[PDB]
Design a protein around this nucleic acid. Structure first.
Lengths: 94, 141, 136, 38, 73
RNA sequence: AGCCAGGAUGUUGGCUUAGAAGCAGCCAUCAUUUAAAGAAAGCGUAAUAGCUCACUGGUCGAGUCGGCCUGCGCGGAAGAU
């Protein structure tokens, strides 16, 4: 039943992404369908606080972006190596 | 009826009115002259038979007069012979011997009532059917 | 101590120890000991770390070792000038990278699992942490 | 007194205070638990 | 009493019961002959010289595993 | 968190009963009200009593407890004109 606040990120890249995670926010991607993918940025602190629940990985995740809210599923979590933070999440648009 | 200073809460045998191994510490602690105390013990000792353990409370007044309100078989010692055997424990969950009913123990709870008036007839029986559990005995009715 | 039975060569080049690690998730049991520093672990410290925490639970649960020494580190004998050939292999190490899952175990309660890893960590020359199996 | 570079609260009553900048542990019950420098 | 008994138990002593007279607390126990060695030198070291005892024989009872294995030469 | 009332213990519960009386530790982990109470950690102790601890009955009347992620500091730190 979790809700995610997010927005569309622009000017992507390696150093661009490294610039993000040193600002308490981290990138992602939403794909799956007859459309184009969506490189979505979402807050780091909020979703890391809620990833402990099993319903974060067993539910149609309600990410809202520019008003338009979609129901997605969590594919994979590319997390940080040794720091307890995380680096990237893949949200398949189920 | 003072405090706990001279209050000793233990005894074992009625018929053996002489200081037994566990009543030894108890007696010596408060210098109990058991001999004349045996004559006062044997007024109520004769009312009960031998084979079922009896405790005592000891009260010493300020003027060297020492008295007591002795007992009849309480909680543990009556439920044991109710099962038939005095012991057989050390393994509550690991042993299973006998099955006893509470209605028959409702009668012996009334015998514990005039002795050691333990709260709520069946809930004291539940407190003591756990002593049966603690003695490795099953109880079902 | 742990040692490779029948490897291909006697000696091996020194080699830098850069980058990150591959073993990151607690993949077998539930409680693991991820490494936070970047060094190397010889076999004697490998044997000593398990020993201290095996007897911390004394038998309990399964304990997996996720690192094995591959690098055959040599040393030169004393009073010997430089050169004259590579020295004989003395001990075997496993190069540790940041974010590497070391010793992992299961079947133990959590509070004593963090306790057993705390007894093991002080025997390690690498700063580690206590990590827990997440889903996926 | 034990000049141990690590100090552990070894009991219940063992309290840790910072005297003269130095961390010191004292105990009301056991005087064997007194230590400093940690 | 407690001290004497703790030390009786210590010398493999069977404290048994704690009796009492008027000014004294009498405690009788069973003690091995092997741990009788210099007992009153250790008795009044714990009782300020105000105690006493008298040793009597009962039986050649059981010698435990640590006491059985000792004297075998 | 303190202060007074206390510790709401049936159960001297087996056992090993020489005592292990919640207080040797294996165990049942029962139950009493279901306003303050685990069949129990700890020195203390031969063993009780014990003072406590868990929990506050009520007194006062406001914020508080411990981890997590980290910025900058302390100790760790003793050498010879």
């Amino acid at each position: 039943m979790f809700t995610i606040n997010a927005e569309v990120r622009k000017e992507q890249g390696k150093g661009a992404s490294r610039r993000l995670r040193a600002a308490n926010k981290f990138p992602a991607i939403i794909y799956g369908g007859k459309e184009a993918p969506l490189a979505i940025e979402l807050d780091h602190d909020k979703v890391m606080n809620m990833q402990a629940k099993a319903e974060f990985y067993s539910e149609v995740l309600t990410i809202v972006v520019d008003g338009k809210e979609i129901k997605v599923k969590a594919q994979d979590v590319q997390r940080h190596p040794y720091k307890p933070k995380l680096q990237h999440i893949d949200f398949v648009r189920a | 009826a003072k405090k706990v200073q001279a209050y000793v809460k233990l005894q074992v045998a009625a018929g053996m009115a002489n200081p037994s191994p566990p009543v030894g510490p108890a007696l010596g602690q408060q210098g109990v002259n058991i001999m004349e105390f045996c004559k006062a013990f044997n007024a109520k000792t004769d009312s009960i038979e031998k084979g079922l353990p009896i405790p005592v409370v000891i009260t010493v007044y300020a003027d060297r007069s020492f008295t007591f309100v002795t007992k009849t078989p309480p909680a543990a010692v009556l439920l044991k012979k109710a099962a038939g055997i005095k012991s057989g424990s050390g393994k509550p969950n690991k042993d299973k011997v006998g099955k006893i009913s509470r209605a028959q123990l409702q009668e012996i709870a009334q015998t514990k009532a005039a002795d050691m008036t333990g709260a709520d007839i069946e809930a004291m029986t539940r407190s003591i059917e756990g002593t049966a559990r603690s003695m490795g005995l099953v109880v079902e009715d | 101590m742990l040692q490779p039975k029948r490897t291909k060569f006697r000696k091996m080049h020194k080699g830098r120890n850069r980058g990150l690690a591959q073993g990151t998730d607690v993949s077998f049991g539930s409680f693991g000991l991820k490494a936070v520093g970047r060094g190397r672990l010889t076999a004697r410290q490998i044997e000593a770390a398990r020993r201290a925490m095996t007897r911390a639970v004394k038998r309990q649960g399964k304990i997996w070792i996720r690192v094995f020494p591959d690098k055959p580190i040599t040393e030169k004998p004393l009073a010997v000038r430089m050169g004259k050939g590579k020295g004989n292999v003395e001990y075997w190490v496993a190069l540790i990278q940041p974010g590497k899952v070391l010793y992992e175990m299961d079947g133990v309660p959590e509070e004593l699992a963090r306790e057993a890893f705390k007894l093991a960590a002080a025997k390690l020359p690498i700063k580690t942490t206590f990590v827990t199996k997440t889903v996926m | 007194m034990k000049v141990r570079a690590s100090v552990k609260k070894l009991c219940r009553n063992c309290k840790i205070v910072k005297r003269d900048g130095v961390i010191r542990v004292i105990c009301s019950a056991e005087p064997k638990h007194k230590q400093r420098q940690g | 009493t407690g001290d004497v008994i703790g030390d009786l138990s210590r010398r493999r002593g069977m404290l048994k019961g704690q009796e009492s007279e008027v000014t004294g607390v009498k405690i009788h126990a069973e003690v091995p002959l092997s741990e009788m060695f210099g007992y009153a030198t250790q008795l009044r070291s714990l009782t300020k010289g105000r105690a006493s005892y008298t040793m009597e024989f009962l039986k050649y009872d059981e010698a435990p595993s640590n006491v059985a294995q000792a004297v075998i030469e």
